[PDB]
Amino acid sequence: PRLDGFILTERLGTVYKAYAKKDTREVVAIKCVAKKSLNKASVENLLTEIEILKGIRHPHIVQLKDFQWDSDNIYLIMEFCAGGDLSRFIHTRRILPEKVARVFMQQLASALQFLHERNISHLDLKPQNILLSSLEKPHLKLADFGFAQHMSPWDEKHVLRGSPLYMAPEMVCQRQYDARVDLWSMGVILYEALFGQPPFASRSFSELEEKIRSNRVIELPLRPLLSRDCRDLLQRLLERDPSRRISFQDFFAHPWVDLEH
């Protein structure tokens, strides 16, 4: 068995806020899923997610504190993030100034380098999956490892993974992909922070699909005005051909990011 060790206090969205019986200052968010709701596939994917999360600890990744179950449900017991999600942070400001976006991208890059060096791909990077430690001067943390996979540079995958407005175009267009899809998604996040919406925002799904399958190079809006190094990074992340896209190593070393310094 049963959900043990926690006092539930509030519905957050099903997700509950709770505190540990042994340390009442330790606050957690508990995601509750009905076993009825899950495929054979989905049971198998949930097990790979838990195995991925149990082995990692990083200041920019939401920590799995515990995993439990009873007769009817599974419970993912996560580090509580009091600042909400990056989606809301952006939308309530409309757009972020370049200087703010830069600090944010450097934090996200630290987490992506940690995962890449362990041959882990997240595969669903987006602002709704990035949580904030507080409302002002936040620390950003990666959430929702539900699509994450073990992937070294050798591995080629086929099953679609991620979210329509964030997915690298080779997933739809070529029906095969590799770890470099996550650099596309990082490009989308940065574009959304600076301009207010993903580059393929559309009135219908059919309109979005046309944009995904187009060969037209992405045109960065000319307002707001951004630094040359910002534009250079953006343009190289948002390359449609993964073989032409900026490398992981080159992304981590880019002067606008500069993860070593």
Ligand SMILES: COc1cc(Nc2c(C#N)cnc3cc(OCCCN4CCN(C)CC4)c(OC)cc23)c(Cl)cc1Cl
């Ligand atoms: C995306 O994926 C996942 C998301 C979650 N969900 C959360 C995790 C995690 N992880 C951590 N901390 C959370 C904190 C939350 O709210 C904080 C308070 C925000 N304010 C409330 C007051 N009003 C006025 C302004 C906004 C929260 O709220 C919905 C959900 C949280 C989980 Cl448990 C699992 C997965 Cl897979």
Ligand SMILES: COc1cc(Nc2c(C#N)cnc3cc(OCCCN4CCN(C)CC4)c(OC)cc23)c(Cl)cc1Cl
């Ligand atoms: C697998 O991956 C992805 C697939 C999609 N694609 C679509 C999603 C989704 N998702 C949802 N709904 C869609 C609806 C569509 O057509 C509706 C209009 C039908 N016709 C109108 C004209 N009359 C004569 C014939 C019928 C559609 O058409 C091409 C594509 C859709 C996207 Cl957008 C992204 C990702 Cl990642």
